[PDB]
Structure formats: C-alpha cells, structure tokens
CSV table of C-alpha atoms in Angstrom, one decimal:
chain,number,residue,atom,x,y,z
A,1,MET,CA,-22.5,-9.5,-1.6
A,2,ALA,CA,-20.6,-6.3,-0.8
A,3,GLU,CA,-18.1,-8.7,0.6
A,4,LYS,CA,-16.0,-9.5,-2.5
A,5,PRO,CA,-13.3,-6.9,-1.8
A,6,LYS,CA,-13.2,-4.1,-4.5
A,7,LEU,CA,-9.8,-3.1,-5.7
A,8,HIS,CA,-9.6,0.6,-7.0
A,9,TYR,CA,-6.6,1.3,-9.2
A,10,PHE,CA,-5.4,2.0,-12.7
A,11,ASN,CA,-5.7,-0.8,-15.3
A,12,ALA,CA,-2.0,-1.6,-14.7
A,13,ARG,CA,0.2,-3.7,-12.4
A,14,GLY,CA,1.6,-0.7,-10.5
A,15,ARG,CA,1.0,-0.6,-6.8
A,16,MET,CA,-2.1,-2.9,-6.7
A,17,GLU,CA,-0.5,-6.0,-8.1
A,18,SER,CA,1.0,-7.5,-4.9
A,19,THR,CA,-2.5,-7.3,-3.4
A,20,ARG,CA,-3.9,-9.0,-6.3
A,21,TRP,CA,-1.3,-11.8,-5.9
A,22,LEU,CA,-1.9,-12.1,-2.1
A,23,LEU,CA,-5.8,-12.4,-2.5
A,24,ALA,CA,-5.4,-14.9,-5.2
A,25,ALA,CA,-3.0,-16.9,-3.2
A,26,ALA,CA,-5.4,-16.7,-0.1
A,27,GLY,CA,-8.1,-18.0,-2.6
A,28,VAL,CA,-10.2,-14.7,-2.0
A,29,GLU,CA,-12.4,-13.7,-4.9
A,30,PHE,CA,-12.3,-10.0,-5.6
A,31,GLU,CA,-13.6,-7.3,-8.0
A,32,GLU,CA,-11.7,-4.6,-9.7
A,33,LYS,CA,-12.7,-1.0,-10.4
A,34,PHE,CA,-10.4,0.7,-12.9
A,35,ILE,CA,-9.4,4.3,-13.1
A,36,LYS,CA,-9.8,5.0,-16.8
A,37,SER,CA,-10.5,8.7,-16.7
A,38,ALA,CA,-10.1,11.8,-14.5
A,39,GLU,CA,-13.8,11.2,-13.6
A,40,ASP,CA,-13.2,7.9,-12.0
A,41,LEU,CA,-10.6,9.5,-9.8
A,42,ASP,CA,-12.9,12.5,-8.9
A,43,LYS,CA,-15.8,10.2,-8.0
A,44,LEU,CA,-13.7,8.3,-5.4
A,45,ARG,CA,-12.3,11.6,-4.0
A,46,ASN,CA,-15.8,13.2,-3.9
A,47,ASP,CA,-17.4,10.3,-2.2
A,48,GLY,CA,-14.7,10.7,0.5
A,49,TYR,CA,-13.3,7.2,0.0
A,50,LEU,CA,-9.6,8.3,-0.4
A,51,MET,CA,-8.0,9.3,3.0
A,52,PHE,CA,-5.0,11.1,1.3
A,53,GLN,CA,-6.7,11.6,-2.1
A,54,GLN,CA,-4.8,8.7,-3.8
A,55,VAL,CA,-5.3,5.1,-5.0
A,56,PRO,CA,-4.7,2.1,-4.5
A,57,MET,CA,-7.8,1.8,-2.4
A,58,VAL,CA,-9.4,-1.4,-1.3
A,59,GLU,CA,-13.0,-1.7,0.0
A,60,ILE,CA,-12.9,-4.6,2.4
A,61,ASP,CA,-14.8,-5.4,5.6
A,62,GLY,CA,-16.6,-2.1,5.7
A,63,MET,CA,-13.2,-0.2,5.5
A,64,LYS,CA,-11.8,2.1,2.7
A,65,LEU,CA,-8.1,1.0,3.1
A,66,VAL,CA,-5.6,3.2,1.3
A,67,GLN,CA,-1.8,2.8,1.4
A,68,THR,CA,-0.5,-0.6,-0.1
A,69,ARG,CA,1.2,-1.7,3.0
A,70,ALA,CA,-1.9,-1.1,5.2
A,71,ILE,CA,-3.9,-3.1,2.7
A,72,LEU,CA,-1.4,-6.0,2.4
A,73,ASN,CA,-0.9,-6.1,6.2
A,74,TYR,CA,-4.6,-6.5,6.9
A,75,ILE,CA,-5.2,-9.1,4.1
A,76,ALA,CA,-2.2,-11.1,5.3
A,77,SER,CA,-3.4,-11.0,8.9
A,78,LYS,CA,-7.0,-11.8,8.0
A,79,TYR,CA,-6.1,-14.9,5.9
A,80,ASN,CA,-3.3,-16.1,8.4
A,81,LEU,CA,-0.4,-15.4,6.1
A,82,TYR,CA,1.4,-13.1,8.5
A,83,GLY,CA,3.1,-15.6,10.8
A,84,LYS,CA,1.9,-17.0,14.1
A,85,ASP,CA,3.5,-14.5,16.5
A,86,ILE,CA,5.5,-11.2,16.8
A,87,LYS,CA,8.8,-12.9,16.0
A,88,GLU,CA,7.6,-14.7,12.9
A,89,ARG,CA,6.1,-11.3,11.7
A,90,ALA,CA,9.5,-9.6,12.2
A,91,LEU,CA,11.2,-12.2,9.9
A,92,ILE,CA,8.4,-11.9,7.3
A,93,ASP,CA,8.5,-8.1,7.6
A,94,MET,CA,12.4,-8.0,7.1
A,95,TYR,CA,12.1,-10.3,4.2
A,96,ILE,CA,9.2,-8.5,2.4
A,97,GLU,CA,10.6,-5.0,3.0
A,98,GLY,CA,13.8,-6.2,1.2
A,99,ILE,CA,11.5,-7.4,-1.7
A,100,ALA,CA,9.6,-4.1,-1.6
A,101,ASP,CA,12.7,-2.1,-1.9
A,102,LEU,CA,13.8,-4.1,-4.9
A,103,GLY,CA,10.2,-3.8,-6.4
A,104,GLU,CA,10.3,-0.1,-5.9
A,105,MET,CA,13.5,0.2,-8.0
A,106,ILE,CA,12.0,-1.8,-10.8
A,107,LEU,CA,8.6,0.1,-10.5
A,108,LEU,CA,10.6,3.4,-10.7
A,109,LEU,CA,12.7,2.7,-13.8
A,110,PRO,CA,10.4,4.4,-16.3
A,111,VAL,CA,10.6,7.7,-14.3
A,112,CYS,CA,14.2,7.8,-15.2
A,113,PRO,CA,15.3,9.8,-18.2
A,114,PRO,CA,15.7,7.7,-21.4
A,115,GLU,CA,19.4,7.4,-21.0
A,116,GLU,CA,19.6,6.8,-17.2
A,117,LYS,CA,17.3,3.7,-17.6
A,118,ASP,CA,19.9,1.2,-18.8
A,119,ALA,CA,22.7,2.2,-16.3
A,120,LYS,CA,19.9,2.0,-13.5
A,121,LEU,CA,18.7,-1.3,-14.7
A,122,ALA,CA,22.2,-2.6,-14.8
A,123,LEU,CA,22.7,-1.8,-11.2
A,124,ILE,CA,19.4,-3.4,-10.2
A,125,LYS,CA,20.4,-6.6,-11.9
A,126,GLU,CA,23.6,-6.7,-10.0
A,127,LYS,CA,21.7,-6.2,-6.6
A,128,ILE,CA,19.5,-9.0,-7.6
A,129,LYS,CA,22.4,-11.5,-8.3
A,130,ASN,CA,24.8,-10.4,-5.7
A,131,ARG,CA,22.6,-9.1,-2.8
A,132,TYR,CA,18.9,-10.1,-2.8
A,133,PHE,CA,18.9,-13.5,-4.3
A,134,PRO,CA,21.7,-14.8,-2.2
A,135,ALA,CA,19.9,-13.5,0.9
A,136,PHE,CA,16.8,-15.5,0.3
A,137,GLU,CA,18.6,-18.6,-1.0
A,138,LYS,CA,20.5,-18.5,2.3
A,139,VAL,CA,17.3,-18.4,4.3
A,140,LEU,CA,16.0,-21.5,2.6
A,141,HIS,CA,19.3,-23.3,2.6
A,142,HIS,CA,19.8,-22.7,6.3
A,143,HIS,CA,16.6,-24.3,7.6
A,144,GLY,CA,15.9,-26.6,4.8
A,145,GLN,CA,12.1,-26.0,4.8
A,146,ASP,CA,9.8,-25.5,1.9
A,147,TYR,CA,8.7,-22.0,3.0
A,148,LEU,CA,10.6,-18.9,4.1
A,149,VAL,CA,9.0,-18.5,7.6
A,150,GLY,CA,7.3,-20.8,10.0
A,151,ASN,CA,7.3,-23.9,7.8
A,152,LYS,CA,4.0,-23.0,6.1
A,153,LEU,CA,2.9,-20.7,3.5
A,154,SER,CA,3.1,-16.9,4.2
A,155,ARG,CA,3.0,-13.7,2.4
A,156,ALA,CA,6.6,-13.7,2.2
A,157,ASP,CA,6.6,-16.7,-0.2
A,158,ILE,CA,4.0,-15.1,-2.2
A,159,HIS,CA,5.7,-11.7,-2.5
A,160,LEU,CA,8.9,-13.4,-3.3
A,161,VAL,CA,7.6,-15.6,-6.0
A,162,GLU,CA,5.8,-12.5,-7.5
A,163,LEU,CA,9.2,-10.7,-7.6
A,164,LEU,CA,10.8,-13.9,-9.2
A,165,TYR,CA,8.3,-13.5,-12.1
A,166,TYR,CA,9.2,-9.7,-12.5
A,167,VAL,CA,13.0,-10.6,-12.4
A,168,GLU,CA,12.5,-13.2,-15.2
A,169,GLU,CA,11.1,-10.4,-17.3
A,170,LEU,CA,14.4,-8.5,-16.8
A,171,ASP,CA,16.8,-11.3,-17.2
A,172,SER,CA,15.7,-14.9,-17.3
A,173,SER,CA,19.2,-16.0,-16.1
A,174,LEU,CA,19.3,-14.0,-12.8
A,175,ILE,CA,17.7,-17.0,-10.9
A,176,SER,CA,19.7,-19.7,-12.6
A,177,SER,CA,22.4,-20.2,-9.8
A,178,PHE,CA,19.6,-20.3,-7.1
A,179,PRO,CA,18.1,-23.7,-7.0
A,180,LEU,CA,16.1,-23.2,-3.9
A,181,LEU,CA,14.4,-20.1,-5.3
A,182,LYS,CA,13.7,-22.0,-8.5
A,183,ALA,CA,12.0,-24.7,-6.5
A,184,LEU,CA,10.1,-22.2,-4.4
A,185,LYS,CA,8.8,-20.5,-7.6
A,186,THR,CA,7.6,-23.8,-8.9
A,187,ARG,CA,6.2,-25.0,-5.6
A,188,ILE,CA,4.1,-21.8,-5.2
A,189,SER,CA,3.2,-21.5,-8.9
A,190,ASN,CA,1.6,-25.0,-8.7
A,191,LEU,CA,-0.6,-24.2,-5.8
A,192,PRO,CA,-4.2,-24.5,-7.1
A,193,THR,CA,-5.3,-21.0,-6.4
A,194,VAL,CA,-2.0,-19.4,-7.7
A,195,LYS,CA,-1.9,-21.7,-10.7
A,196,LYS,CA,-5.4,-20.5,-11.6
A,197,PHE,CA,-4.2,-16.8,-11.1
A,198,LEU,CA,-1.4,-17.4,-13.5
A,199,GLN,CA,-3.1,-18.9,-16.5
A,200,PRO,CA,-4.5,-16.5,-19.2
A,201,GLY,CA,-8.1,-15.1,-18.5
A,202,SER,CA,-7.4,-14.8,-14.7
A,203,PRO,CA,-6.9,-11.2,-13.3
A,204,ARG,CA,-3.1,-11.0,-13.4
A,205,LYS,CA,-2.0,-7.7,-15.1
A,206,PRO,CA,0.6,-7.5,-18.0
A,207,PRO,CA,3.8,-5.5,-18.2
B,1,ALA,CA,16.5,-8.4,28.5
B,2,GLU,CA,19.3,-6.1,27.5
B,3,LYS,CA,18.9,-2.8,25.9
B,4,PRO,CA,18.1,-2.8,22.1
B,5,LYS,CA,21.2,-1.8,20.0
B,6,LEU,CA,20.7,0.8,17.2
B,7,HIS,CA,23.2,0.6,14.4
B,8,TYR,CA,23.1,3.7,12.2
B,9,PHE,CA,25.0,6.9,11.4
B,10,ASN,CA,25.1,9.6,14.0
B,11,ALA,CA,22.1,11.4,12.4
B,12,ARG,CA,18.3,11.4,12.2
B,13,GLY,CA,18.1,9.6,8.8
B,14,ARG,CA,16.1,6.4,8.7
B,15,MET,CA,16.6,5.6,12.5
B,16,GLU,CA,15.0,8.6,14.0
B,17,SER,CA,11.4,7.3,14.0
B,18,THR,CA,12.7,4.1,16.0
B,19,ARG,CA,14.4,6.5,18.5
B,20,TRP,CA,11.1,8.4,19.0
B,21,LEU,CA,9.1,5.1,19.4
B,22,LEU,CA,11.5,3.4,21.9
B,23,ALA,CA,11.7,6.6,24.0
B,24,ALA,CA,8.0,7.0,23.9
B,25,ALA,CA,7.6,3.4,25.2
B,26,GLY,CA,10.1,4.1,28.0
B,27,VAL,CA,12.6,1.7,26.6
B,28,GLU,CA,16.3,2.2,27.3
B,29,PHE,CA,18.6,1.6,24.2
B,30,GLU,CA,22.2,1.8,23.1
B,31,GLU,CA,23.5,3.3,20.0
B,32,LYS,CA,26.5,2.2,17.9
B,33,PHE,CA,27.3,4.9,15.2
B,34,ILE,CA,28.8,4.3,11.8
B,35,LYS,CA,31.5,6.9,11.4
B,36,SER,CA,33.7,5.2,8.8
B,37,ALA,CA,33.7,2.5,6.1
B,38,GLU,CA,35.4,0.2,8.6
B,39,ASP,CA,32.3,0.3,10.8
B,40,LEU,CA,30.0,-0.7,7.8
B,41,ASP,CA,32.4,-3.3,6.7
B,42,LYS,CA,32.5,-5.0,10.2
B,43,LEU,CA,28.7,-5.2,10.4
B,44,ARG,CA,28.6,-6.7,6.9
B,45,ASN,CA,31.6,-9.0,7.4
B,46,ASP,CA,30.1,-10.3,10.7
B,47,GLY,CA,26.8,-11.3,8.9
B,48,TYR,CA,24.8,-8.9,10.8
B,49,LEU,CA,23.0,-7.2,7.9
B,50,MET,CA,20.6,-9.4,5.7
B,51,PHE,CA,20.7,-7.0,2.8
B,52,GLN,CA,24.0,-5.3,3.6
B,53,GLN,CA,22.3,-2.1,4.8
B,54,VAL,CA,21.4,-0.2,8.0
B,55,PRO,CA,19.3,0.7,10.0
B,56,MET,CA,19.8,-2.6,11.9
B,57,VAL,CA,18.5,-3.1,15.4
B,58,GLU,CA,19.7,-5.8,17.8
B,59,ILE,CA,16.7,-6.8,19.8
B,60,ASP,CA,15.4,-10.0,21.4
B,61,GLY,CA,18.0,-12.2,19.8
B,62,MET,CA,17.3,-10.9,16.3
B,63,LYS,CA,19.4,-8.7,14.1
B,64,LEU,CA,16.5,-6.8,12.4
B,65,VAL,CA,17.0,-4.7,9.2
B,66,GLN,CA,14.4,-2.7,7.3
B,67,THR,CA,12.9,0.3,9.1
B,68,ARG,CA,9.4,-1.0,8.8
B,69,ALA,CA,10.2,-4.4,10.2
B,70,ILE,CA,12.0,-2.8,13.2
B,71,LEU,CA,9.0,-0.4,13.8
B,72,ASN,CA,6.4,-3.0,13.5
B,73,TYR,CA,8.1,-5.3,16.0
B,74,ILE,CA,8.7,-2.6,18.5
B,75,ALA,CA,5.2,-1.3,18.1
B,76,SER,CA,3.7,-4.8,18.8
B,77,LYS,CA,6.0,-5.6,21.7
B,78,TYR,CA,5.1,-2.5,23.7
B,79,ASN,CA,1.4,-2.5,22.9
B,80,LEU,CA,1.5,0.6,20.6
B,81,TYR,CA,0.1,-1.3,17.6
B,82,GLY,CA,-3.7,-1.1,18.5
B,83,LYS,CA,-5.9,-3.8,20.0
B,84,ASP,CA,-6.9,-5.9,16.9
B,85,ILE,CA,-6.6,-6.3,13.2
B,86,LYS,CA,-8.9,-3.4,12.3
B,87,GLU,CA,-7.2,-1.0,14.6
B,88,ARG,CA,-3.9,-2.0,12.9
B,89,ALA,CA,-5.5,-1.3,9.6
B,90,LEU,CA,-6.3,2.3,10.7
B,91,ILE,CA,-2.9,2.7,12.3
B,92,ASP,CA,-1.1,1.4,9.1
B,93,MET,CA,-3.1,3.6,6.9
B,94,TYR,CA,-2.2,6.7,9.0
B,95,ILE,CA,1.4,5.9,9.5
B,96,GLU,CA,2.1,5.1,5.8
B,97,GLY,CA,0.7,8.4,4.9
B,98,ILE,CA,3.1,9.9,7.5
B,99,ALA,CA,6.0,7.8,6.1
B,100,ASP,CA,5.1,9.0,2.6
B,101,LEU,CA,5.4,12.6,3.7
B,102,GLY,CA,8.5,12.1,5.6
B,103,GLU,CA,10.1,10.3,2.6
B,104,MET,CA,9.6,13.4,0.5
B,105,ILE,CA,11.2,15.6,3.2
B,106,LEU,CA,14.2,13.2,3.7
B,107,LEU,CA,14.7,13.1,-0.1
B,108,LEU,CA,14.6,16.9,-0.4
B,109,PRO,CA,18.4,17.7,0.1
B,110,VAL,CA,19.2,15.4,-2.8
B,111,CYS,CA,17.6,17.8,-5.2
B,112,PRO,CA,19.6,20.1,-7.5
B,113,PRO,CA,20.1,23.5,-5.9
B,114,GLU,CA,17.5,25.0,-8.2
B,115,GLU,CA,14.4,22.8,-8.6
B,116,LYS,CA,14.3,22.2,-4.9
B,117,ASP,CA,12.1,25.3,-4.4
B,118,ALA,CA,9.5,23.4,-6.7
B,119,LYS,CA,9.8,20.3,-4.7
B,120,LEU,CA,9.5,22.2,-1.4
B,121,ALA,CA,6.4,24.0,-2.7
B,122,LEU,CA,4.8,20.7,-3.6
B,123,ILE,CA,5.5,19.4,-0.1
B,124,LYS,CA,4.0,22.4,1.6
B,125,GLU,CA,0.9,22.2,-0.5
B,126,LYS,CA,0.5,18.5,0.3
B,127,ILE,CA,1.0,19.2,4.1
B,128,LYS,CA,-1.6,21.9,4.0
B,129,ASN,CA,-4.3,20.5,1.5
B,130,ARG,CA,-3.7,16.7,1.8
B,131,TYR,CA,-2.0,15.4,5.0
B,132,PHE,CA,-2.9,17.8,7.8
B,133,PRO,CA,-6.5,17.9,6.7
B,134,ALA,CA,-6.7,14.1,6.7
B,135,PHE,CA,-5.5,13.8,10.4
B,136,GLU,CA,-7.5,16.7,11.6
B,137,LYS,CA,-10.5,15.1,10.1
B,138,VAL,CA,-9.7,11.9,12.0
B,139,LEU,CA,-9.4,13.6,15.3
B,140,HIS,CA,-12.4,15.8,14.7
B,141,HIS,CA,-14.6,12.8,13.8
B,142,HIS,CA,-14.1,11.0,17.1
B,143,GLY,CA,-13.1,13.9,19.5
B,144,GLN,CA,-10.6,11.8,21.5
B,145,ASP,CA,-7.1,12.6,22.5
B,146,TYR,CA,-5.5,9.8,20.4
B,147,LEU,CA,-5.7,8.7,16.8
B,148,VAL,CA,-6.9,5.2,17.2
B,149,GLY,CA,-8.8,3.3,20.0
B,150,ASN,CA,-8.7,6.2,22.6
B,151,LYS,CA,-5.2,4.8,23.4
B,152,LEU,CA,-1.6,5.9,22.8
B,153,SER,CA,-0.3,4.2,19.7
B,154,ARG,CA,2.6,4.5,17.4
B,155,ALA,CA,0.4,6.6,15.1
B,156,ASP,CA,0.4,9.4,17.7
B,157,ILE,CA,4.0,9.1,18.2
B,158,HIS,CA,4.9,9.0,14.4
B,159,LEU,CA,2.5,11.9,13.7
B,160,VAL,CA,3.9,14.1,16.5
B,161,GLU,CA,7.5,13.5,15.4
B,162,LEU,CA,6.4,14.7,11.9
B,163,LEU,CA,4.7,17.7,13.5
B,164,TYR,CA,8.1,18.7,14.9
B,165,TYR,CA,9.8,18.1,11.5
B,166,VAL,CA,7.1,20.3,9.7
B,167,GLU,CA,7.8,22.9,12.3
B,168,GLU,CA,11.4,23.2,11.6
B,169,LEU,CA,10.6,23.2,7.9
B,170,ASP,CA,7.9,26.0,8.2
B,171,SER,CA,6.4,27.3,11.5
B,172,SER,CA,3.1,28.2,9.8
B,173,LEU,CA,1.7,24.9,8.1
B,174,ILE,CA,0.1,23.8,11.3
B,175,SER,CA,-1.6,27.2,12.0
B,176,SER,CA,-5.1,26.3,10.7
B,177,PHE,CA,-5.1,22.8,12.4
B,178,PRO,CA,-5.9,23.2,16.2
B,179,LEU,CA,-6.5,19.5,16.9
B,180,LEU,CA,-3.0,18.8,15.5
B,181,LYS,CA,-1.6,21.6,17.7
B,182,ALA,CA,-3.5,20.1,20.6
B,183,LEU,CA,-2.3,16.5,19.8
B,184,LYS,CA,1.2,17.9,19.7
B,185,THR,CA,1.2,19.6,23.1
B,186,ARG,CA,-0.6,16.6,24.7
B,187,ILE,CA,1.7,13.9,23.4
B,188,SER,CA,4.8,16.2,24.1
B,189,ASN,CA,3.8,16.3,27.7
B,190,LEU,CA,3.7,12.6,28.3
B,191,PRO,CA,6.7,12.0,30.7
B,192,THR,CA,8.6,9.7,28.2
B,193,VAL,CA,8.2,12.1,25.3
B,194,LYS,CA,8.8,15.2,27.4
B,195,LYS,CA,12.1,13.7,28.5
B,196,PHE,CA,13.0,12.8,24.8
B,197,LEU,CA,12.4,16.3,23.9
B,198,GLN,CA,14.7,18.0,26.3
B,199,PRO,CA,18.4,18.6,25.4
B,200,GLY,CA,20.8,15.7,26.1
B,201,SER,CA,18.4,13.0,24.9
B,202,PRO,CA,19.2,10.6,22.1
B,203,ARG,CA,17.1,12.9,19.8
B,204,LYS,CA,19.4,13.6,16.9
B,205,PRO,CA,19.7,17.3,15.6
B,206,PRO,CA,18.4,18.6,12.3
B,207,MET,CA,20.5,19.1,9.0
B,208,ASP,CA,20.9,22.9,8.8
C-alpha cells in the first residue's frame, strides 16, 4: 500500500541514515527511492514534492516531509519514541541535539581540504572522549536505568547507538572507558528489529 | 514559576530566536551575560552545561542546552507548537528551512574578506528563488493570516524574525512577496511583538 514510507535520498548514508535507523528500530518497513542522476532530482522538484528543492524527502501519511529534523520528529512521535511528556522531550531533545552536533562534524569532514582533515578529525576524537561520551555515561550512571530517558526505549537511545557505530569506525578505542555506553550499544543492537537492521542484506548503508 | 534565565553572550547569536519566542509568548525572562572567560568557567564548573556550551536556559527546574531543545520546550509550553502531530510536522518543516537560512547568515562573517561576496550572493539567490517562494506559496495556498492551523505558532514568529534579518541584509529581497510583507506587518503589530520591536526591549542589536 502507499503506506510503506518512501525515503528519497542519494544512495549513501548522508542525512537520511538516522531516519533509516529510527524506522528500523520502530519496526516500520519502508521503501527507498535513490537519487542516481540529475533526472531523479528534477522529477521530484517538478512534481512539487520538495518544499525547498532539497532532499532528504520522506513520503509518509500523505505528507511530503523535508528537513531531517521534521522527518525524525514526526516518526519519533508517531511511534511513541519521543517521551511521554514535554519534560521528557526536553531531555531527549537536549541529548539528541548534542549527538546531532557531533554527527554534523563527522559528516562535514570530507568537505575539509585534504590537509585540514586530520587536524579536524583529531579534535572531533578529543570531544568524543572528553566531552560527549562522558556526558552520556553520566546520564546512565546517575539514574542507573537501561535507557537514556523515561526508563524505556526512545529515539535518544537509537540515535546514540547509531553514533557509537560511527565512532567505532573512527577509533574503536574511544568507547573503551565507558562501560555503560558499551552495554547500551549491545542492548540496543540485540533488539530484534535493530539486530535485523544490522546484519548484511538489510537496508543499512555503508561508509 | 520564576522567570526563565537566559545564559549567553550579550549578542544576538544563537539565543536571539529564544528571546523573540519568549517575548512573543508574553513571557518575562532574565538574562545573564557571558562577558569573560570567568563567566563561562563558572557555568561549566557548576555543572550547568551538559556539553560545556551555551545557550543555556534555566526553566522549570531544568538547565536546558541546545537551541532546538530550548525552543521546542518553550514552543510546546506556551501552545505555539500546533495542535497535533501533523501540524508539528508542517511547523518543523518550515522552521528548519528558516533555521537553515539563518545558519548561513550567522556563518557569513566567518568568511575570508574576499569570497564573502560569493557567499552573500548565494544567500540572496536562495532567499529570492528558494525560501521566500516556499513560504509565499504556503500562505497563498490557504489564504489565512498564519502559517499553520489558522493560529499563531512559532513558525510565524521564527519567519518574521528572519524577515527582519533579511531586511537589514537587503531591503529589497522581500519586494516581490506581498503575503510575506503582509505577515510581517500583522505579526509585528501583535502587542507582545510590537513591544519587543520598540527600543529598550531585550532585542539585541545587529553586527555592523
């Protein structure tokens, strides 16, 4: 049915991958429509499906949603992964915008000139070890629960675990002094819908 | 309920959209400005900053960092975030397009004093051929005075703030968009916004 969400993006991770993780974790089946030529982009534009002429775009519930955060916020709410009230959403939002800030740096490394790259990567790795991983370890340490917010699965656990996988590609030792994050990574990775999303053949896009 | 407390530099920066939103909602707030390294160090050493950065807003017993987290909370608390999940989708779509355009403008004075004319020209093209058409199209399709749900929402507030910023950047980009000009005057005459717009308000000055 026109009821499987359709994700429109290039055939890469890029700015669609966190949506791909969130839907998989919510157990939602979806289709992908890949931009592989200028004509794929022109057709979406001409059909009037791109509010600001840009992808990501997700067809969902009769809507043509653009802007990653709008897409993510809607999916999270629809599948009850956005906390139970305004205060839980503020915690989730705080946490995931920190994650998004870090992801944005990693995502913007290739734009750097060939020589800037390593110096900029080294600073990212330092922020992971000294700023971001301590902040999230502290959240889990302080309430003792198996999830970041509300004592249940939320998009914050899913976005964080996604980031732990990307950080592993940078330096597999960055998580080593953070046992609670390692346990979170394992716990979330073993959830049936996520485990299915992580074995080969599933959607999940490569680096 | 005490007044929210806004921790930032004494500048527009990444706190200004929060100032507009609170003022629009008729909410009184305090500001504590960072004017030295000592000010930042104290916030950090006190544990007030999750990721050691500002903006930070003390509100309802939380120490909220990340602009989007701050804005999302305030918008929901004062009924400026639409009436349901699909209205929030439209609002989110709109305001992230606004946020994208604002981020290019904010990141313009970090350009080398040479290739900034190129960046400024790309910005003006996107305003005229991409962003202003998109919002004019939205208003024309439904004819109503507000972006979403015939009701004031953060989307009207964030757009009109951007309209004022575009205007200081270039008086003319709005010329061929009358519904945007119309939205700007209407929102600007709401009592709370009208007050925020007069001199003496917490509205921070530009960066000339």
